[PDB]
């Protein structure tokens, strides 16, 4: 049994909506690290709630319905990879589990598997229909595709 809102895009990495504080114990049973993409005002609890449960945080705030830069994306991907190499499972989350986190998940499959944007987008949207919500989110993935 695993937290049922985790949408796995490979064996070790998943994306999701925001976990409530009362869900963190269950999340922490399977995930060692979390990439938090919401801005501080969106958090209903301190990010220390993750750390105290043994879940290492990368806070990479992106305003809702906007896109990270390609440079930010590459930083997040290396951080995920570092933890996957240690045998850890990693969760990526935003608020809805669709746009910000879907964008990072697409980027992750491109980076980790060499998938085309099309292939990676199809797989992420099979896990969460509607993932990658805005034009600018699509554009930064095209920009990333050119560079990896
Ligand atoms: O809070 V999300 O960009 O689905």
Automatic annotation (TrEMBL):
InterPro entries attached to this UniProt entry: Dual-sp_phosphatase_cat-dom, Prot-tyrosine_phosphatase-like, PTP, PTP_cat, Tyr_Pase_AS, Tyr_Pase_cat, Tyr_Pase_dom, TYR_PHOSPHATASE_DUAL_dom
Presence of the UniProt keyword Hydrolase in the record: yes
Domain named Tyrosine-protein phosphatase: which ranges?
A: 2-148, 3-148
Provide the GO MF annotations for this entry.
protein tyrosine phosphatase activity
Write out the GO cellular component annotations.
cytoplasm
Q: Where is the Tyrosine specific protein phosphatases domain?
A: 71-139
**Keywords, alphabetical:** Hydrolase, Protein phosphatase
Q: Does the keyword Repeat apply?
A: no
This chain belongs to the protein called Protein tyrosine phosphatase
Q: Which organism is it from?
A: Thermococcus kodakarensis (strain ATCC BAA-918 / JCM 12380 / KOD1) (Pyrococcus kodakaraensis (strain KOD1))
């Amino acid at each position: 049994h695993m937290w049922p809102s985790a949408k796995f895009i490979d064996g070790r990495v998943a994306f999701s909506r925001m976990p409530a504080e009362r869900e963190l114990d269950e999340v922490a049973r399977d995930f060692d690290a979390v990439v938090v993409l919401v801005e501080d005002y969106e958090l209903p609890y301190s990010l220390d709630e993750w750390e105290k449960r043994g879940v290492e945080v990368l806070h990479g705030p992106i305003p809702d319905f906007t896109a990270p830069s390609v440079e930010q994306l590459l930083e997040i991907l290396r951080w995920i990879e570092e933890r996957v190499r240690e045998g850890k499972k990693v969760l990526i989350h935003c608020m809805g589990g669709l746009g910000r986190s879907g964008t990072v998940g697409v980027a992750w499959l491109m980076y980790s598997r060499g998938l085309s944007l099309r292939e990676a987008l199809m797989e992420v949207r099979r896990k969460r229909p509607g993932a990658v919500e805005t034009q600018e989110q699509m554009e930064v993935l095209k920009e990333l595709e050119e560079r990896i």
